[PDB]
Design an enzyme around this catalytic site. Sequence first.
Site, PDB file in Angstrom:
ATOM      1  CB  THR A  98      -0.786  -0.224   0.989  1.00 17.44           C
ATOM      2  OG1 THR A  98      -1.841  -1.042   0.969  1.00 17.44           O
ATOM      3  CG2 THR A  98      -0.925   1.388   1.671  1.00 17.44           C
ATOM      4  CD  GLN A  99       1.936   1.774  -3.965  1.00 11.04           C
ATOM      5  OE1 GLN A  99       0.186   1.435  -3.432  1.00 11.04           O
ATOM      6  NE2 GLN A  99       2.243   1.258  -5.092  1.00 11.04           N
TER       7      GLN A  99
END
Lengths: 195, 195, 233, 125, 225, 211, 222, 204, 195, 195
Positions: free
Chosen positions: C1-2
């Site tokens: 996740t970013q």
Amino acid sequence: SIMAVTFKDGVILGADSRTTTGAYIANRVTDKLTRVHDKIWCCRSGSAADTQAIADIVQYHLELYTSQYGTPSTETAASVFKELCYENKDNLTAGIIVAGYDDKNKGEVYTIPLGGSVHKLPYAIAGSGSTFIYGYCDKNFRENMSKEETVDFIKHSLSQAIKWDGSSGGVIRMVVLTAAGVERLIFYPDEYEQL
Amino acid sequence: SIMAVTFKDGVILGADSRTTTGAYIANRVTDKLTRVHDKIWCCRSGSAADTQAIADIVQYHLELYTSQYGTPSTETAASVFKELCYENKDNLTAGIIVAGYDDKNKGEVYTIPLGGSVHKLPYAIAGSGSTFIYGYCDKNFRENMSKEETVDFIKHSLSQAIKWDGSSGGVIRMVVLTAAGVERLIFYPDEYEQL
Amino acid sequence: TQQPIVTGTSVISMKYDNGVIIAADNLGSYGSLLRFNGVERLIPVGDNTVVGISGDISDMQHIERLLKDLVTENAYDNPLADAEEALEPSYIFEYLATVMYQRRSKMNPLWNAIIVAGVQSNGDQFLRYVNLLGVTYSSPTLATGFGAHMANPLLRKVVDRESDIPKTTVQVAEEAIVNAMRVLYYRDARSSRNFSLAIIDKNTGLTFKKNLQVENMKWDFAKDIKGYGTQKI
Amino acid sequence: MTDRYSFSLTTFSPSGKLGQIDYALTAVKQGVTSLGIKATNGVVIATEKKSSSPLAMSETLSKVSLLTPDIGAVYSGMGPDYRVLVDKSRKVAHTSYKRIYGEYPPTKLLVSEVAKIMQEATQSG
Amino acid sequence: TIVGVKFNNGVVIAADTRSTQGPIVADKNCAKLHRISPKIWCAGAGTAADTEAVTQLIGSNIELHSLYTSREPRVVSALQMLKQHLFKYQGHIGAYLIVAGVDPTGSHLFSIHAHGSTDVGYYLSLGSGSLAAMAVLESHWKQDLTKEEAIKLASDAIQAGIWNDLGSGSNVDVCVMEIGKDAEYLRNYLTPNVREEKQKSYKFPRGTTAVLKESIVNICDIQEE
Amino acid sequence: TMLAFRFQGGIIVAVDSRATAGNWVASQTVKKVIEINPFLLGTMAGGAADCQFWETWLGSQCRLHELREKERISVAAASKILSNLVYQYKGAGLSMGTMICGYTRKEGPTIYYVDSDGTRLKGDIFCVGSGQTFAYGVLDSNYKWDLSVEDALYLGKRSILAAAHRDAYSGGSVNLYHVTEDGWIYHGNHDVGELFWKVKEEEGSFNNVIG
Amino acid sequence: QFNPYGDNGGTILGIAGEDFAVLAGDTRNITDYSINSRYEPKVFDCGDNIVMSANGFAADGDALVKRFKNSVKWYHFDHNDKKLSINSAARNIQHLLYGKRFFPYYVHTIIAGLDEDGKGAVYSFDPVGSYEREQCRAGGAAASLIMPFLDNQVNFKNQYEPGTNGKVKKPLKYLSVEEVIKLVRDSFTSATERHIQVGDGLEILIVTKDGVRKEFYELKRD
Amino acid sequence: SDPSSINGGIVVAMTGKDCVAIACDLRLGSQSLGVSNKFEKIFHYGHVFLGITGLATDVTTLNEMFRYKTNLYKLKEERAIEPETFTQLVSSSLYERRFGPYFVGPVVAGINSKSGKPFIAGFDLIGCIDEAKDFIVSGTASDQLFGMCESLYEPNLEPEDLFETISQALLNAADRDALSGWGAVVYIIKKDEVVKRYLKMRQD
Amino acid sequence: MDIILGIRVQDSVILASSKAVTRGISVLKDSDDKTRQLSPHTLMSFAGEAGDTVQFAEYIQANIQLYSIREDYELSPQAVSSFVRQELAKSIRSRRPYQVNVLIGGYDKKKNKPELYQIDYLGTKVELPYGAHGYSGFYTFSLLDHHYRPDMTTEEGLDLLKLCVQELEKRMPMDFKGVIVKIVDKDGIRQVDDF
Amino acid sequence: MDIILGIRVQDSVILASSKAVTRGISVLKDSDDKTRQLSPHTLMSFAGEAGDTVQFAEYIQANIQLYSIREDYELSPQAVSSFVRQELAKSIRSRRPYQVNVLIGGYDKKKNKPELYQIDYLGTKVELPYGAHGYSGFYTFSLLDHHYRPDMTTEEGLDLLKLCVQELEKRMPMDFKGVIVKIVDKDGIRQVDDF
Ligand SMILES: [Cl-]
Ligand SMILES: [Cl-]
Ligand SMILES: [Mg+2]
Ligand SMILES: [Mg+2]
Ligand SMILES: [Mg+2]
Ligand SMILES: [Mg+2]
Ligand SMILES: [Mg+2]
Ligand SMILES: [Mg+2]
Ligand SMILES: [Mg+2]
């Protein structure tokens, strides 16, 4: 406040010398212009720990490159930086400007912001203080400037960035990259504040 | 992007025309230069609702002031703005620049940032796009400029602010305040982008 | 996740009688700052496909490399690499769509929205969308981001359904695309005036147009607008 | 300051008369004549425009007033008192009826509301 | 999807007729065009009860004001009263309006945001379909529009919302306010979404439903004798 | 709602048929009893998929047992395979309530309650699911060890009916089983829409309702 | 934070006849309040006289269908081109779904075909694999609108025979393919009116002993 | 937690030819627990009918409130209130509690005594009027009711046919909702006669 | 869970209420009477949050007793229940609501009928043949669905109630320390001292 | 709260453990034996989270039985308790710890002495004359502080235990459905069938 500018004879890197922990200046004479190869240098912004660790690794990769394949290009150096910044983007806070001089390609500048993207440019600015000089730099930059004109451009630009940004300050360090060699410059407050 | 600049014959207000909801431009021809008295105008930044409600109230106070005590000073207008912004600081998001012309005091500029503080200045810049022109404006501003020089200064300054700030754009509106009267100016993209 | 950092806005496209058109502006935004002004977000693959990408630019550059490597790999031990066994738009798309869905399933997505525009071996038009979730769909008009909200309505006035495609010429389609790009410059706060446009025709091949500008803009009516209600002056 | 007249100014006299109401009716008697007639398909109300001066524009003074689209009013007596009653009558037609039921009040109920206002001025402090 | 378009001798507003609760369509023929005064109409988006109630309140006060002043109401008065009311409630009254009309001053067109901001324009759009509508307005609007050109542009903008926006649908309502004329309200100006005939009739045989008890309900009053 | 009780003539097993997704009634015709083998039954409560998947898996493991050991698995060992399995997945989010009912020579009629929490209980009476309380109320008050196969079948059926009525998330129909020395015996699907009114008339109960 | 799931809307419907079966679904694809496509097929011919649809999050639905088609391919390779029965397909799909029990395919799955006795069959799944054979089943966005209608008009629920007054039920007479398609079209026309994610087009796949046939019908585009 | 779905329940109304129909279920519960099967949700003030779904305490409270207001209306106006007027009274009354609303979903049904025109209307919990020609739905099974009504309904139905249509709409929608059912009542309304029928439905 | 039950038979209403008062980990009392006589032929049992229960019951009691003195007349159970409901319906939107659930058992001397009303803390009133608050209903409702008739005697009602209490004592986890049973009929209110 | 008690007297150890198994709102069983025989002269009672309790007890049981077969010898209660403690001490830093508290009652045949060990889920071991887990100790410890002697007989120990159970039945809020009592002495382990 960091920047790199290409000109007729090559490229010049420039930076302030302030390192902060909140509002305390942990180091007022920091050297943000670091060497990854004889004529390939970088400007560091963001986390000091992250940018140091990255620059140390890149220097290792280019030293090993040189032993096997000879002098690397500035584009090659930017790619190694990118690969580290992109693949470890979740755990890094590093804004790096790569600048180098070839005889074939002459002066080149590559900027590598937070995400890990690469952008080749005539000149580049970065760091928290760069926000205040986007207007000044865009209006005053020209291609194929002289060494003396380019030094004045960086000096005036970082002077304003330092004036407005609290996270920027101290001395203005510069590194000149040409066929002639590598020249280090320094400019103190009394000189650049009165501009 | 908003600004107000004093010069020899009086003062000029300047602004962009963009209003946003996130990244959607709700209005591309907004008038951010608003009148609170014949020769006292303001530049609005922040919440459109808050700044409108405030400017409407101030206009009411100065109309009532004029009926009783005659023409108010620009300092008096800035004080009424301040009183509203300061006492309701918890519930407001309004960055206002007040500018006016007297015959006695000539052109005056007062900026009122978020907290509700007042600052009298030779010139002022505000809004999200002002960050990108702190360097340019500081280097290029002079006192006692001509009308034509001041118009060029605002035009060039807001041009850069619009270029870099996504929240700024559209046309450049300007309002000139002198003894001669009140002149409204407008500058379209094709004119100012090529600068 | 970013989280996405340097981003690209809308990518718009549509089918016409003999091929497909695709366009996208040359901007790389850094939040509210319009930082990079010379970014090419249309990436040709061979002479029969153009991939238009929006979203995170670092991930775009990664995808750009995958496609470049895909061409290299397809040429290996392939005497018909420039003919029968050349890369098709359908091959290139399914590859990307596979990658995008795999990456979202590892909870480490490529934060992009992609449109693959091209023409197949049999002359059939290809236009399909894929995004960070691995979600895919096809339509006579496709657009990402703000283009989905503002461009599609305009392009669907030209090609509302499948039967309208043979009736639509390249001049009419290009006119619609260019108009849509102007509208986005009026209304998208993360757009630029400068853009690139690509046409893939089954007869005339791939035409790649760079350094286009939005022109014939309407601003004059702004002078008449004064205040926000009661202000006469 | 403060309104320290919290007591009634209209009271019963030994004979059972409410003096102020009687005297108010005397003021009405002095007033200009006005009338009303009801027909099968309509109603008419009328009065004389007694102009105080020929320089005065009698068109600007309206003795006959619209209360609702289907209700009108005319008076005899003190004009200023009538003017404020019309203002209150118009408002009460909205607040106590139209804003509740979404329609204008019937004649008798609007009259009832006006009557209430006039009664209160006969008993309040 | 609601729009407002200025033209030569007046102003026109238009709206779709869909009312939704989440993904469900509550009303297929909702009336989003409200009357503040005879020649001042507004179109509302957002919280339906809020747009109606705020429209009726200001409409009531405008009527009383018009009676007090012996003058026809102005659009700027409705504008000012609305924005001050909405501002006071800090956006909690979710009313987003396009206000238009003609008065002794001329023709006017404004938009109102729920927090109390107002905007002036020659063409405006609000609602979930505002982007689809504005794309049409930005493509086809010009200065010196005729009445017939403006109605076309307005209804075209609403259609863009009907077809392309899921929050908008069904029919197109219009109201034209021209100077020196009565305002004409055109309810269901367009009807491009009529339901097709069903394949079957679902009328049941009488007696199909099982019943337990029957009884007459006394709705009348108490009787004499 | 699902119940299982032991008595003179073996075991009664009764379940409802409703499946919900929030307030939405997804199905009225689901099979909450799984015929593992001719002498083993499994009841299902909680996660539909969790119950179905792992109880059909259980049947595969019970079949493998009698292939290797040349003998039918006991209720104890069968219940423990399932309980040991769900215990491995403890904390992951499985939601199952299960009664493994059956007969063997050495055990006799036996009922084991198995839970996704890892609980495994042997007992004579169990009621599980969102309607367990309603079924317990009827079952407990009318239970005796010496019921006739006929009276016991009715009590279990009546106990589910009670729960289907009061519990919103129970209903549809009643599936009945009877387990003896010679295996299980299905005793039909009983729609509540007809069974309710029949019971009301014949039994004279359910006076809370307008009928 | 990254949300790996989405909602592409749509609605599907499966009805089983005496010697046939249908699986219908609208062709609209959406995100939030925008339309992605007015024609994006949602019901697929998977081979061996089986049709399938996985409605909800399209990326998951496409993946599942793609995997089941692959399962059919390998069933032929591994078992001498044996035909995969509908009951065997259903059980295989349970295992595909439950295999991702702790990171679910966010879809409502329906398959239709013929059982081994030649009678029509419909199977319905939840996202994590629980399945059940049914005579009638709607799935997706407008399933709550359609299923009650099918309980009434397919299984004659709450319907009795006049004159008896609630004593005798309506007999469960079988439905023809022509009668079923009418109910399908009316179901989707009604759902299109009251659900914003339903519309544009209706594609029906009919399955008989002769094979798989398609029928397409327009729906309102608002 | 969600007040509108604690007690459960549904109401539906339909127009026919010179007639209207309004129906409701009889359940009252506390989430899963069924408590009462005699909780009627339809009330009448003269010849105007009102069905209310949602939180039961508010249903009871609002009935008592509208009984109060309609009784005073009648005393002052010297006539019974009409559906169109009553509809506005409901809207007014609900919106005065805009920021502390009654958690209800009202449905008005009736015939104008003067014009003879059939009238139905629905509201949201804060006042918004939904004046439909065909039908109005409210409750925990509103989605189900929308689907049944939209498919079963046809205009200009006769009283005895309209009864079957609305009854089947309610019954089959209630059977797909856990919180609705436990009995049902249907009112068939004509200009000068009103019939009330209790339906036989499954009690689960 | 403070078990309170109610059953209306042919000629009387029977209320059963648990005796335990548990505060935290300890049972402080095992003989608590959770009821108040509102009038000679009306009894109210109650259960809910500590303190609020008694405070509410006694407040209602005082009001009904005041009414009785003022009018020299006993209110009908229906009238008393409506008064109680309104107080709870008023309470739920207060600053701090009464967290009390009640059963009202009464004998109407006018109609010669027993009446049982169940009212929760929200103000949700229902007339029932038998009722319960809290978790007790989850066991007892279905049991009474099976064993109840409208024409039952008081003795049959008590046997039916014993069946409820036995089930609760078997299946509920708390020891509620038995129940106090009270009968409400034409002759008034009396307590069953042996249960 | 799953009441488990233990008392060590002159010549034996007595363990008492509640019979109730409550899952949520229902008492699923009222005859549950919360203990396992580890060896002929060693008994372990247990209480904690559902599933974990039995799984842990049976796992320990299997290990001790394995040891007994391998060496043809019974481990001392002290040795068994140390083994159990280590397993729990290992468990507490695992991915998912055993949430089980235990009492170990044993008769050491070598020293001819009864021994009682109390071990919690953290692996906290203590040898005691009397012990309890959970909330039971809050009532019973102080009661046993008053009535205990080291030279008590088994019959006196049972009377003392009845006094504990009576207090728990009076003051604790849950109905734990009585206790199963087991005695551990030189002759082995036996159950008191009437208590
Ligand atoms: Cl450093
Ligand atoms: Cl503004
Ligand atoms: Mg920095
Ligand atoms: Mg800009
Ligand atoms: Mg039920
Ligand atoms: Mg639709
Ligand atoms: Mg139900
Ligand atoms: Mg209650
Ligand atoms: Mg311890």
